[PDB]
């Protein structure tokens, strides 16, 4: 299995969240961020491709948030810049199989983080 | 005059109401398919890919009582456009990797019908098949490459195969059939088998072709270059020990030559994971070429870098004898295998 | 009872009025399509292509109420061309680079109809499946390759895949024998996958391949190791023999890069350094330093009678340090990639 | 009647009298064809052929008034063998060299009708598309490969193509994996092209591919650099060692010639010097200039106190002049092709 | 136009237009020659492969003729039919005499186009990739020029029944798109077209002809063969500056350089078909080989004389050859290049 | 006058009720099939595949009494689809490996009827055929190999093949060219062959190819000769320069073993020695002895005029005996 953890939660401004992975990560070349708030369904935020650097984001965060990676440290960083009150949520880290379906749908993601919290 | 048209009202009297979706005697009896093979040519064998290619006339026969008729002629040939409308068995090759059923000017298929309802159905195929080769004996190895074929959909409870003439005279190789550039086709054997799978139990036809490799190519390709490289490393023993660069050059250059040859020989084979009878030769020739350099490394240290000329005088005799003894034993043990 | 005419007029009343265009029990619950595989052989595995070629028998089960029949005890077997007139699930392999159904004699398809409407449909396939590999440990690697099976048109509201018999659903894997690899393990999966158009059913077959180290011992390590040992002979030849110790050293440089060129074609042009690259460059550095050692000695012997001792002293220490350092390096290399 | 029979009667009623010879809404305004793509992978990129291989899910979406139906709320998902009996846009790829639709199990096609007559239609395609590549900056280059999509039969008076969803019309670009390249960005185009037979609509998909330098550093530049550094050993060995000074000198020159000539089989015949060729030619001049340096040390030493003094002065400078000049050359090279 | 009844009346003429009609026969079989008009639009020329003497071209291939049976009247003047009807309407069997292998591309229905004019004029168009056999001669290999032909015409119908004419007139028919030319090594100089009548075992046939003129860009073989050879010659001549007493040195230069010439002589094997005669480049290799080989023999005689006859003034040969060899190799280049760059 | 309507019903009347499943004159005497071939070109001839590629126009003639229209004088030609509705002979090439009919614009077939019922049926075919080669004379060899034309389904008492016009039945053989070979002769033959299922008719087309020696003189022999002559420089460098006498000789020895690979990696793994193998081994021995001579003289000298004695003969013995070897080599292979 591939094991994940999270760090960087806080309160507003800007924050930086990070996700660390260990194990056979090469089988899961894509990782993404998903956010959830009380009384709502889980949303998509963004994704990163290992060793490729390509990214895509949801419209609600386009050009506000950015995601990057460190291949030697095996971590994915989400620069949560320019917060707004609507961003209050927990931000789960997740990993994706190579041949699974579209990125925008959480059911395609297998291993998940603990669900760090942000407040604004 | 009417032979051209009395036929049509007979044959259309056979095909009307006919159903090719159902094998003959479906309810009553097991369909029996007689078969034989004529290998119009064999080879080549590509051991680098674990396969061989064969080109065959593949022939089949059975009775379909629905096509029994009576008319002005005992047996009649038919164009292949009819071969689609009449039931034909689903024979396939269990170990076939790739194959070609030939079209040229028409499909290369034949169908002839007797007045007993007995069919004879024939086609030309080119077949490339997997072969289970052991290569521990590479330079003087041998194979039994199989050809196995049988029904796909119909199990043994519905259709069975038998060789047309029964005995070994049911698989034939054409006299001009050899395309083997590197082998003898020593002989053949023919058999029968049953197999159980997830779709039922089946009956299989098997033919094994026995192959033995020609040693001639590798003698001039690798053995002689190895032997000569050993001799080159060895002739240095006749040169003075005072002229250092000459002794040094023979040593390193021959080891470099062995490195090329060691890489070259295994440029063939399908990257097997074990040492062959070929490697146990190159390795020994490599060992002598290497020790022929360490011999000088010893002498030079004791003649300059301090009466050791004994080593030089012996190396002109011992190394020949030890190499001859190894070579004699090597060919004696593998050639007489 | 089972007279020929009776069978014909039984089948024809199944096909007459049948519609290939609509799945069984359209509008109703999903069709449960049971899968089953028998691996005939794995032809080859290739890193330069990041693919492996697979040959297998492939079977499928489902119930179609429209094809039920009575009065005939048999499990009817029909000519394969009935496949063009029935409905069949449109399963396909995602990660295939090229695939084809074998066409010897007749296209290798099978259909068998049971009285209760359970169709069994199967065919023999050879497929080249893409599998990119983790070459960060190339000589000592351990790969995961898979075959992804999925339905193209129908969503989960219409079709459900499931392995017939669970662990028994794939056979013949333990009978496979690759030259370069050994099948450590195989494992099965069933899951949903959701695209923008809806949720799609999937099965997948996975293998784990561990490499047989024996090949590299013959062609990579021993040749390079013994060249490194040969390069040390410079330390034993007298330091006054300039024409020899330089020629010996540079020839090993030529031989070392000669091995590297014969490793140029066997592997893809991957960006990061592989374990084999680390070892070969490590040996190249040992040979390169073993040559520079003479230049350092020759310069000192002539950048002046005590220098006659200095040249001997440097040779005496180089006589020990190089073999000792190489053994330490070699020990660290193997124990690193074996333990870490 | 019934949820089975009613659907069958509807489908037959739609296609009875349908005419595949005529486009939707023939003679009226053009029928707009929306479309989108999901990329599966880019299999390879080849300088030797000036092409790349693309595998993708390719989808189309258009109105057809003749296929509307009423009383059924479902989005009918007919079997893919309907596609031979409907109209479909004659869309095609202009820069295609060789390509096919996958045919395992059943030829990979999809159809999905809707009550108001709008149709969705898709294929899984592997296509080898030509791509002109500017190799002058190789291997530090970036290439713009594209796929050019066009309607063949119908002019712009009859057909219009538009990326469905705009900027989001192409997906899966971040699941493209290539050892040699990484995608910087992808950009979409929509245009009307003109030929002698009319004006035709065009859509284009383009990738900006940037090469990875890791391989060429590890296996092309470093071997050349080390051979160049080896060529400076002559300056430290005694000038009296003519045999050693030469044998190593012509060996490095020989090796440099081998590297320059034998690497080019991996890439196409091209009439202009590439960046790395300029480097391997540049480093070659250094090693040859080093060999000529010895030749004129031997000349002045033997053929023309000057016999000792002038030989020593030249040899002593070369130990710092060549390394300094090479570093200056190397610095200029890596500044030019990176900065300008 | 009339969109309410549009979709119905057209299908009610387009099917009645071709019942009784059969494609087995020419239009006007008994009365007239079928005058086909043809045109070509080259999307991309190249690449070219010397080792197989063939080249690849990607073209839109256009055709037109008048078929009397398909003349009609309706509320529009031109019909953009779906390409499937090309199977039912008669079409000419134009084929390319020089084709080794060719493809009619087939994504999403064939890359095939058909249109009907009001007066029955067909226009029929398709996209092809043609691998055409190009005869070529190689005396002037690295400085040669070629004319690669493309020839096409009827197969079944003789001259008496079907003829071909370029649409716009010969010189304005065929077009090359400069956005798509795919030559890497060659450079296209121009194109020209014409016609011919030929007679075979089955009567006369009319052939359209198109010649594409090609010239080679020398740049590749400069950095690939000439510079390595030119400088291997210079490298061998460096021997003349080393003192004659350095026997090991003066030898390894010549031996190594001759080995270089041997490798480079063999290296040309990859760039050519197995031609039966020597090219101009082979003469250049031979001359470079001669100088390099001679430069080694120069030391052999000096080393013999200086010590087999140790009262000879043998240093003269070092002094003479040190200037003679560079000059002789210099004038050779001005004879070689001037012979072929002006040719 | 209204001919178009008249030919329409004529062609329809012929095909209506035409039973394709029978050969012409079924049950009567065999139907004669005449044949013509026009060679378009012969592409690569390959030793490593033991095959050659051929492209040709292939034409067939026969009578079918069922097709004898009478009211029209034209040699009526028809579209290429009709060939799938008329009967045609099932000719096949027994020794082909990979082949296809061309489909450039429409699958290249010609159908041309005549009032007397004769049908002329033609194809444009590209075929790769097996061509077994005796390489023991390589590269001075002459290769004979053929195209075997045969009927598959019908025995000799149902179809008879024959060349039209005899030795003039094949054209274009004087027009084709190859870089590696030249056509010496071509022959046409017809005969029966017997399988267990009956006697079948056959036609055979044969070519005799002679290789162009001009290429291998430049590519293989001349490098070998010059390397051998270079090794003799060892005999003019005297026996004091030990570093030179060895480096010169050993380099040539290394070269001689090297240049074999570049050829033999592009050439089949046949066991027997080819002509170049005899020459390369011959040159290798001469080059090898040219080095062993120095290893001998050092043992003589370092153990003295005897050294200069052996050297001075060796300068002329090697050139003489090598010239004799070269003379015998070409005498054996060229003139005998
Ligand atoms: C070669 O590579 C592969 C890729 O690395 C290796 O692992 C497999 O990879 C595939 C993806 O390619 C992966 O799916 C598969 O994991 C198994 O999947 C099973 C199905 O899970 C689905 O259905 C479940 C329905 O209950 C559902 O729970 C699953 O996830 C959802 O629920 C969970 C739990 O709430 C959420 O966390 C998640 O976010 C989802 O909402 C999913 O929808 C599953 O059966 C299996 O094991 C689990 O389930 C079992 C039954 O409950 C338990 O007994 C078991 O402990 C697990 O919980 C896996 O999760 C893996 N395969 C494995 C075995 O992990 C291949 O193994 C490798 N091959 C080789 C030979 O090494
Ligand atoms: C790889 O390489 C390919 C090929 O070189 C690159 O493709 C090119 O991409 C650019 C964008 O990066 C394209 O330009 C855009 O094109 C469209 C279409 O414009 C056309 O159609 C319009 C609708 O009919 C029409 O109005 C246009 O005419 C106007 O614009 C032209 C511009 O030349 C002007 O001259 C006219 O007078 C008109 O005003 C035209 O027919 C269009 O949407 C875009 O317009 C944007 O940019 C312009 C910039 O001036 C701006 O004015 C607008 O407001 C708007 O913002 C834009 O022009 C170009 O067509 C592509 N080229 C080809 C040959 O296809 C590709 O980008 C490369 N990829 C990568 C990843 O690097
Ligand atoms: C390449 O290599 C191939 C294979 O070696 C060569 O092909 C051979 O070509 C020769 C001709 O050069 C062929 O033989 C000719 O065959 C015909 C027909 O003979 C048949 O029919 C006769 C009745 O019409 C019958 O009598 C013959 O029976 C005799 O021959 C067979 C076979 O040898 C033998 O078994 C019998 O016992 C009989 O002896 C046979 O069935 C024939 O016309 C030729 O000449 C004969 O006939 C004429 C009169 O017609 C007469 O004038 C001649 O004197 C002579 O009697 C000749 O026999 C041979 O069959 C071909 N072999 C194969 C295997 O196909 C090919 O030529 C080579 N190419 C090149 C370019 O060299
Ligand atoms: C082979 O022959 C017939 C010729 O009529 C054709 O219908 C068939 O489809 C061809 N087969 C292939 C595999 O192309």
Q: Contact at 8 Å (CB) between C117 and C67?
A: yes
Q: Are residues B312 and B258 in the same domain?
A: yes
Nearest by CB to D26, from E7, E219, E245: name it: E7
Cα E289 to Cα D3: distance, rounded to the nearest angstrom = 88
Cα C59 to Cα C61: distance, rounded to the nearest angstrom = 7
Q: Contact at 8 Å (CB) between F97 and F46?
A: no
3-state class of B185 per DSSP? strand
Q: What is the DSSP letter of C68?
A: -
| The pair of three-digit structure tokens given for residue B253, joined into one six-digit string | 């250059």
Q: Rounded to the nearest 10 degrees, how much is the dihedral formed by the CA atoms of E123, E127, E131, E137?
A: 60
3-state class of C57 per DSSP? strand
Q: Contact at 8 Å (CB) between F324 and F245?
A: no
DSSP β-ladder status, B31-46 and E34-49: unpaired
Domain with residues F3-211, CATH architecture? Distorted Sandwich (2.70)
Domain with residues C4-211, CATH architecture? Distorted Sandwich (2.70)
Which residue, judged by its Cα, is nearest atom 5 of ligand 3? F144
Cα B11 to Cα B82: distance, rounded to the nearest angstrom = 10
Instruction: List chain C residues with CB under 8 Å of A107.
Output: 192-194, 199
Q: For residue B331, give the H/E element and its range.
A: helix B309-335
Side-chain half-sphere CA neighbours of A96 within 13 A: 26
Nearest ligand (C-alpha, residue D145): 2
Helix axes C275-302, C242-261, angle to 10 degrees: 170
CA F259 vs CA B220, E27, E168, F220, F319: distances in Å: 14, 65, 58, 8, 22
Q: Are residues E225 and E109 in the same domain?
A: no
CA D97 vs CA A37, E227, E236: distances in Å: 51, 36, 48
Cα A73 to Cα A71: distance, rounded to the nearest angstrom = 6
Instruction: List chain F residues with CB under 8 Å of B67.
Output: none
CA D317 vs CA D243, D299, D324, D325: distances in Å: 21, 17, 11, 12
C/D Cβ contact: 3+ pairs below 8 Å: yes
Strand partners, B183: B213
| The pair of three-digit structure tokens given for residue E273, joined into one six-digit string | 């078909």
3-state class of F318 per DSSP? helix
Q: Contact at 8 Å (CB) between B143 and B130?
A: no
Class of domain A3-99 as given by CATH = mainly beta
Residue D197, annotated as binding a ligand: yes
Nearest ligand (C-alpha, residue F204): 3
Q: Which residues line ligand 3 (CB under 6 A)?
A: F 144, 146, 185, 187, 189, 191, 204, 206, 208
Final residue of a structural domain among B167, B188, B213: B213
DSSP β-ladder status, A89-96 and A116-119: antiparallel
Record: contact A107-C192, CB cut-off 8 A? yes
Q: Are residues B58 and B110 in the same domain?
A: yes
CA F289 vs CA D266, D291, E307, F232, F293: distances in Å: 40, 33, 25, 10, 6
Strand partners, F121: F60, F111
Helices (H), chain C: 4-15, 214-216, 222-231, 242-261, 275-302, 307-339
Record: contact F223-E266, CB cut-off 8 A? yes
Number of helices followed by number of strands (H, E) in chain F: 6, 12
Q: Are residues E56 and E19 in the same domain?
A: yes
Instruction: List chain A residues with CB under 8 Å of D207.
Output: none
Cα E67 to Cα E65: distance, rounded to the nearest angstrom = 6
**Among B53, B337, B23, which residue's Cα sits nearest to residue B183?**
B53
Q: For residue B245, give the H/E element and its range.
A: helix B244-265
Cα F233 to Cα F252: distance, rounded to the nearest angstrom = 11
| The pair of three-digit structure tokens given for residue B301, joined into one six-digit string | 């240290």
Q: For residue E308, give the H/E element and its range.
A: helix E280-308
Q: How buried is E103 (Cβ within 10 angstroms: 0-12 exposed, 13-18 middle, 19+ buried)?
A: middle
Q: Contact at 8 Å (CB) between E83 and E110?
A: yes
Interface residue A102 vs chain C (CB under 8 A) = yes
- E runs forming strands in chain D: 31-46, 51-63, 91-93, 96-101, 109-112, 118-130, 142-151, 159-163, 170-171, 181-195, 198-211
Angle, alpha carbons E30-E32-E37 (nearest 5°): 135
DSSP β-ladder status, F31-46 and E203-216: unpaired
Q: What is the DSSP letter of F221?
A: I
Cα F54 to Cα F43: distance, rounded to the nearest angstrom = 6
Domain boundaries, chain A: 3-99
Nearest ligand (C-alpha, residue F202): 3
Backbone phi, psi, residue C99, to 5°: -150, 155
DSSP characters over B214-237 = -SHHHIIIIIHHHHHHHHHHHHGG
Cα F284 to Cα F280: distance, rounded to the nearest angstrom = 6
Residues 248-267 of D with CB under 8 A from E: 250, 253-254, 257, 260-261, 264-265
What is the number of the ligand 4 atom nearest to the C-alpha of C103? Answer: 13
Cα B160 to Cα B137: distance, rounded to the nearest angstrom = 39
Q: Are residues E157 and E9 in the same domain?
A: yes
Record: contact C122-B294, CB cut-off 8 A? no
DSSP characters over F254-317 = HHHHHHHHHHHTTS---SSPPHHHHHHHHHHHHHHHHHHHHHHHHHHH---HHHHHHHHHHHHH
Record: contact D197-E44, CB cut-off 8 A? no
CA distance A76 to chain C (A): 20
Cβ-proximal residues to C316 (8 Å cutoff; 6+ apart), any chain = none
DSSP characters over D65-124 = GGG---S--S-----GGGGGGS----EEETTEEEEEE--SSS--EEEE--TTSEEEEEEE
Q: How buried is B89 (Cβ within 10 angstroms: 0-12 exposed, 13-18 middle, 19+ buried)?
A: buried
Name the resolution in angstroms: 3.8
- E runs forming strands in D196-266: 198-211
**CATH number corresponding to F214-333:** 1.20.58.390
Which residue, judged by its Cα, is nearest atom 69 of ligand 3? F206
All CATH 1.20.58.390 domain ranges in chain D, comma separated: 214-339
Cα C12 to Cα B48: distance, rounded to the nearest angstrom = 51
Which of F143, F156, F189, F207 most suits a substitution to test ligand 3, by most atoms within 8 Å of the C-beta? Answer: F189
Q: Are residues E22 and E160 in the same domain?
A: yes
| The pair of three-digit structure tokens given for residue C132, joined into one six-digit string | 């990119």
Q: Contact at 8 Å (CB) between C182 and C143?
A: no
CA distance E7 to chain D (A): 6
Interface residue F173 vs chain E (CB under 8 A) = no
Cα D197 to Cα D189: distance, rounded to the nearest angstrom = 23
Cα D85 to Cα D75: distance, rounded to the nearest angstrom = 19
3-state class of E32 per DSSP? coil
Give the mutation candidate from C1, C2, C3, C4 for the B interface (greatest B CB count, under 10 A). C4
**Among D13, D5, D10, which residue's Cα sits nearest to residue D71?**
D10
Record: contact C244-B248, CB cut-off 8 A? yes
Residue F294, annotated as binding a ligand: no
Number of helices followed by number of strands (H, E) in chain A: 0, 11
Question: Which residue range(s) make up the domain with B161?
Answer: 3-213
Is the shortest distance between the CB of D187 and ligand 2 below 6 Å? yes
Domain with residues D5-211, CATH architecture? Distorted Sandwich (2.70)
Helix axes F275-301, B224-235, angle to 10 degrees: 10
Nearest by CB to A108, from C134, C194, C204: name it: C194
| The pair of three-digit structure tokens given for residue C14, joined into one six-digit string | 């199944």
What is the number of the ligand 2 atom nearest to the C-alpha of D187? Answer: 71
- Identify the residue whose tokens are 């230049």: C295
Q: Are residues E247 and E142 in the same domain?
A: no
Cα B222 to the center of its chain, rounded Å: 23
| The pair of three-digit structure tokens given for residue F280, joined into one six-digit string | 């390369």
* Proportion of chain A in helix, strand, coil states, percent, rounded to 5: 10, 50, 40
CA F40 vs CA C51, E100, F169: distances in Å: 41, 10, 14
Interface residue E306 vs chain D (CB under 8 A) = no
Q: Residue E290 belongs to a domain with what CATH number?
A: 1.20.58.390
Cβ-proximal residues to B258 (8 Å cutoff; 6+ apart), any chain = B226, B229, B282, B285, B286, B289, B290
Backbone phi, psi, residue C215, to 5°: -65, -50
Longest dimension (CA), chain D: 119
Q: Are residues B202 and B252 in the same domain?
A: no
All CATH 2.70.170.10 domain ranges in chain D, comma separated: 5-211
Angle, alpha carbons C39-C43-C49 (nearest 5°): 120
DSSP characters over C292-338 = HHHHHHHHHHH---THHHHHHHHHHHHHHHHHHHHHHHHHHHHHHHH
Number of helices followed by number of strands (H, E) in chain B: 7, 12
CA C187 vs CA B102, C52, C58, C182, C206: distances in Å: 41, 17, 17, 15, 5
3-state class of B36 per DSSP? strand
Final residue of a structural domain among B213, B228, B259: B213
All CATH 2.70.170.10 domain ranges in chain F, comma separated: 3-211
Q: Are residues E86 and E177 in the same domain?
A: yes
All CATH 1.20.58.390 domain ranges in chain F, comma separated: 214-333
Interface residue D196 vs chain E (CB under 8 A) = yes
Give the mutation candidate from E53, E69, E202 for the F interface (greatest F CB count, under 10 A). E202
Question: How remote is the CA of residue E123 from the centroid of ligand 1, in Å?
Answer: 59
Question: How remote is the CA of residue D202 from the centroid of ligand 2, in Å?
Answer: 12
Final residue of a structural domain among B187, B213, B239: B213
Residues 216-235 of F with CB under 8 A from E: 218-219, 223, 226-227, 230, 233
Omega of the bond leading into F139 within 30 degrees of 0 (cis)? yes
Which of F156, F206, F210 most suits a substitution to test ligand 3, by most atoms within 8 Å of the C-beta? Answer: F206
| The pair of three-digit structure tokens given for residue B83, joined into one six-digit string | 């071969």
Q: Are residues E201 and E231 in the same domain?
A: no
**Among E166, E146, E222, E213, which residue's Cα sits nearest to residue E37?**
E166
Q: Does domain C214-339 have CATH number 3.40.640.10?
A: no
3-state class of F322 per DSSP? helix
Instruction: List chain A residues with CB under 8 Å of D174.
Output: 30, 47, 49, 52, 54-56, 103
Q: Rounded to the nearest 10 degrees, how much is the dihedral formed by the CA atoms of E287, E290, E291, E293?
A: 150
Q: How was this structure determined?
A: cryo-EM
Q: Residue E197 belongs to a domain with what CATH number?
A: 2.70.170.10
């Amino acid at each position: 299995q591939v094991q994940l953890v999270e760090s960087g939660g806080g309160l507003v401004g800007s924050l930086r969240l990070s996700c660390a992975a260990s194990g056979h990560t090469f089988n899961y070349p894509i990782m993404g961020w998903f956010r959830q708030a009380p009384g709502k369904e889980r949303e998509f935020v963004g994704a990163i491709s290992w060793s490729g650097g390509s990214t895509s984001y949801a419209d609600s965060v386009k050009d506000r948030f950015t995601i990057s990676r460190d291949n030697a440290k095996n971590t994915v960083y989400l620069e949560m810049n320019n917060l707004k009150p609507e961003d209050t949520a927990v931000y789960y880290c997740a990993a994706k199989g190579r041949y699974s379906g579209g990125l925008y749908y959480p059911t395609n993601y297998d291993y998940w983080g603990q669900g760090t919290q942000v407040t604004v | 005059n009417d032979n051209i048209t009395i036929f049509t009202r007979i044959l259309d009297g056979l095909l009307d109401g006919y159903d090719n979706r159902l094998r003959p005697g479906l309810g009553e009896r097991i369909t029996q398919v007689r078969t034989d093979i004529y290998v119009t040519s064999f080879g080549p064998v590509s051991d680098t890919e674990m396969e061989y290619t064969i080109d065959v006339f593949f022939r089949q026969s059975w009775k379909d009582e629905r096509l029994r008729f009576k008319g002005p002629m005992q047996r009649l040939p038919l164009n292949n456009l009819l071969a689609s409308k009449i039931w034909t068995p689903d024979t396939f090759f269990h170990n076939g990797k790739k194959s070609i059923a030939h079209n040229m000017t028409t499909p290369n298929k034949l169908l002839r019908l007797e007045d007993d309802g007995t069919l004879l159905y024939t086609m030309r195929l080119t077949i490339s098949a997997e072969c289970p080769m052991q290569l521990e004996d590479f330079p003087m190895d041998a194979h039994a490459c199989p050809l196995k074929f049988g029904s796909y959909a119909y199990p043994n409870s519905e259709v069975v195969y038998v060789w047309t003439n029964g005995s070994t005279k049911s698989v034939v190789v054409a006299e001009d059939g050899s395309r083997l550039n590197q082998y003898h086709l020593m002989g053949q054997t023919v058999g029968t088998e049953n197999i159980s799978t997830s779709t039922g139990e089946y009956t299989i036809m098997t033919a094994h072709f026995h192959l033995k490799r020609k040693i001639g190519y590798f003698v001039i390709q690798t053995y002689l270059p190895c032997i000569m490289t050993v001799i080159l490393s060895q002739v240095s023993f006749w040169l003075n020990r005072e002229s250092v660069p000459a002794r040094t050059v023979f040593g390193v250059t021959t080891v470099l030559t062995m490195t090329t040859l060691s890489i070259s020989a295994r440029n063939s084979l399908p990257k097997v994971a074990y040492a062959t009878a070929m490697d146990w030769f190159i390795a020994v020739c490599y060992a002598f070429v290497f020790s022929a350099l360490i011999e000088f490394a010893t002498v030079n240290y004791f003649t300059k870098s301090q009466s050791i000329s004994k080593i030089d005088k012996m190396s002109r005799i011992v190394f020949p004898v030890l190499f001859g003894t190894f070579n004699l034993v090597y060919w004696a043990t593998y050639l007489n295998r | 009872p089972g007279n020929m005419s009776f069978v014909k007029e039984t089948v024809d009343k199944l096909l007459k009025g049948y519609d290939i265009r609509l799945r069984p029990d359209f509008g109703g619950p999903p069709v449960c399509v049971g899968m089953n595989i028998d691996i005939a052989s794995i032809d080859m595995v290739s890193e330069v292509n990041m693919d492996y070629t697979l040959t297998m028998y492939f079977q499928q089960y489902w119930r179609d109420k429209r094809l039920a029949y009575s009065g005939i005890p048999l499990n009817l077997t029909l000519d394969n061309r009935v496949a063009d007139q029935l409905w069949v699930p449109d399963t396909y392999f995602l990660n295939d680079k090229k695939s084809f159904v074998h066409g010897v004699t007749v296209k290798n398809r099978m259909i068998r109809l049971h009285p209760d409407g359970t169709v069994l449909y199967g065919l023999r396939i050879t497929t080249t499946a893409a599998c990119m590999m983790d070459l960060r440990r190339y000589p000592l690697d351990e790969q995961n390759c898979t075959l992804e099976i999925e339905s193209y048109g129908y969503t989960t509201d219409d079709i459900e895949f499931y392995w017939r018999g669970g662990d028994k659903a794939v056979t013949g894997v333990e009978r496979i024998e690759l030259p370069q690899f050994s099948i450590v393990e195989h494992r099965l999966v069933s899951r949903n996958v959701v695209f923008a158009t809806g949720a799609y059913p999937r099965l997948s077959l996975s293998f784990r391949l561990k490499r047989n180290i024996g090949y590299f011992i013959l062609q990579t390590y021993m040749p390079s190791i013994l060249i490194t040992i040969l390069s040390w002979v410079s330390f034993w030849i007298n330091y006054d023999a300039s024409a020899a110790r330089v020629a010996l050293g540079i020839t090993t440089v030529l031989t070392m890069t000669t091995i590297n060129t014969h490793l140029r074609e066997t592997l893809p042009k991957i960006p990061y350094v592989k374990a084999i690259d680390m070892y070969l460059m490590g040996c190249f550095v040992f040979v390169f330093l073993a040559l520079l050692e003479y230049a350092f000695v020759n310069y000192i012997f002539f950048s002046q009678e005590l220098y006659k001792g200095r040249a001997a002293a440097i040779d005496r220490w180089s006589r020990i340090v190089f073999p000792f350092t190489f053994s330490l390096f070699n020990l660290v290399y193997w124990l690193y990639y074996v333990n870490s």
